[PDB]
């Protein structure tokens, strides 16, 4: 797959640099509507290279961004829902909602797996403030130091997922 | 004792010759610890850890490569399975609607 430059150019210097840096190896930069480009290489050598680079690109006066294939990503993990987890939280039982109590806020959650030191908990959007207290610290419960943090994923979908799971079982049989 | 030079306290044995000006014969110190010698020893101390560290670093990189390959392998053999499973079963039970 091919990647997506964002936050540069507009373009002018963009376009110039796009056809200046072809080839050896250096992709080619297809400038677009606003301030971003598609960058077409198909192999997925491109996804590996993009990590270790910050050469083969300049800016006119902008912060560069090299983003994976779709336009958006980072706002989605950051915000809109939460979603929360807590890791120092091994095995040896606290119990249930003593967990929830400690972190305040409203329910719903579980711990997993055997592995290890995390539990995962769904609380709305405003929990952004709550975790920004306990990651900042905090720093103890039981015999071990802590951190909490985020990225989003479900839900969204997870409830409808497991719904369609129980549904699937009956269908199969 | 220590903290005090040994370098001007070497024996100075005057030797005397006719028709040539007199000389002073005095020994080298071969066990003298000097700027140079000490500098070198410091460099030994530093580099002896460095190499061993860098070997380890290379190892950590190499093992990651093995990991990436076995990762993408896993990813495919999960992918193919999970895709075919649901698509198959769906198609089967949908064919019974028109049957």
């Amino acid at each position: 797959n091919g990647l997506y430059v964002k936050n540069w150019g507009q373009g002018s210097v963009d376009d110039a640099r796009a056809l200046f840096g072809t080839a050896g190896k250096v992709v080619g930069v297809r400038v677009r509507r606003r301030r971003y480009a598609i960058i077409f290489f198909e192999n997925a050598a491109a996804v590996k290279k993009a990590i270790d680079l910050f050469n083969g690109k300049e800016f006119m006066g902008n912060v560069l961004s090299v983003v994976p294939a779709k336009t958006t990503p980072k706002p989605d993990p950051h915000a809109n829902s939460s979603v929360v987890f807590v890791s120092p939280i091994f095995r040896a039982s606290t119990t249930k909602k003593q967990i929830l109590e400690l972190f305040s806020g409203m329910k719903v959650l579980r711990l997993r797996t055997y592995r290890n030191n995390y539990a995962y908990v769904y609380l709305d959007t405003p929990a952004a403030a709550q975790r920004a207290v306990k990651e900042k610290n905090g720093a103890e419960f039981r015999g071990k130091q802590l951190r909490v943090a985020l990225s989003t994923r479900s839900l969204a979908k997870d409830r409808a997922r497991a719904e369609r799971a129980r549904l699937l079982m009956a269908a199969q049989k | 004792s220590r903290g005090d030079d040994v370098r001007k306290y070497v024996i100075r044995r005057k030797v005397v010759k006719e028709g040539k000006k007199d000389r002073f014969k005095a020994p080298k110190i071969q066990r003298l610890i000097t700027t140079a010698v000490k500098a070198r020893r410091a460099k030994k101390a530093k580099v002896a850890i460095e190499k061993v560290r860098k070997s380890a670093e290379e190892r950590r990189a190499y093992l990651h490569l093995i990991g990436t390959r076995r990762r993408a392998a896993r990813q495919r053999n999960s992918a193919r399975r999970h895709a075919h499973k649901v698509a198959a079963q769906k198609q089967a039970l949908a064919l019974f609607k028109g049957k």
Binding site: - | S55, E58, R59, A61, Y62, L65, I66, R69
Partner: protein, 258 residues
């Protein structure tokens, strides 16, 4: 322990004469074997002609003005076998030794960034202590941490500017390949097939360009590149094609009429 060599018992790929002298140099042990190597003194004196005498070769080398593998050498006798880059920076010239067609040592002249490239055939792979894998080569070089896809008898592209190994090339399938030893030296062709005889030497059949197939031992295969348009390194004077005896003689005459 042998420390003397006689001109006749020495290779005549070094192109010594029957008369003049009685001895030839026996080189110090190193990357390459006695028959396949060519000693420093031979090169400098009899070919390049920066020396007219033995003593003059000591003068140049002991001092140091000569590098091989990009390392400077103070060695009077050292082997130079195959795929070795030698550089005299005083001239500013970079030679890459190879096998020329007709069994001759080639000395081929390369762009400066090609002289940092080198190709080493792998002989064994094995795991050493700490689980650290090792490819041991035909030049005795130890490549730490080779790729997990490495096999015996494959080539590893080797940067001499700073020591490491970029992507490999395999002996698999049809690929542009050249011969080492066996008196098909310097002849280049595709691998047509690889025969197996277990417990014995494995024949391989090569087909050079403009047909004319032939057979050589697996051991004598040394890979060059993926394809003839993907080669990383230069060819010697002839392209890796031999010609019939008649045509040799014909062309020798044609040029002699000038």
């Amino acid at each position: 322990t042998k420390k003397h060599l006689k001109r006749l018992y020495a290779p005549k790929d070094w192109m010594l004469s029957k008369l003049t002298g009685v001895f030839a140099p026996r080189p110090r042990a190193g990357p390459h074997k006695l028959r396949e190597c060519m000693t420093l003194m031979i090169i400098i004196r009899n070919r390049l002609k920066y020396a007219l005498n033995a003593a003059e070769a000591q003068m140049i080398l002991r001092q140091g003005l000569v590098c091989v593998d990009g390392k400077p050498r103070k060695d009077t006798k050292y082997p130079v076998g195959f795929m070795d880059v030698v550089e005299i920076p005083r001239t500013g010239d970079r030679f890459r030794i190879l096998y020329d067609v007709k069994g001759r040592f080639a000395l081929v002249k390369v762009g400066e960034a090609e002289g940092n490239i080198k190709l080493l055939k792998v002989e064994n792979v094995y795991t050493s202590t700490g689980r650290i894998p090792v490819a041991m080569t035909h030049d005795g070089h130890r490549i730490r941490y080779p790729d997990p896809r490495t096999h015996r008898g494959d080539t590893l592209v080797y940067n001499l500017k700073e020591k490491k190994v970029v992507d490999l090339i395999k002996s698999s399938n049809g690929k542009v390949v050249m011969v080492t030893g066996g008196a098909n030296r310097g002849r280049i062709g595709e691998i047509m097939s690889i025969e197996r005889h277990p417990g014995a030497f494995d024949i391989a059949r090569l087909k050079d360009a403009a047909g004319h197939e032939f057979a050589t031992r697996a051991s004598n295969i040394f890979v060059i590149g993926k394809d003839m348009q993907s080669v990383p390194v230069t060819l010697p004077k002839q392209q890796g094609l031999r010609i019939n005896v008649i045509q040799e003689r014909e062309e020798k005459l044609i040029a002699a009429e000038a």
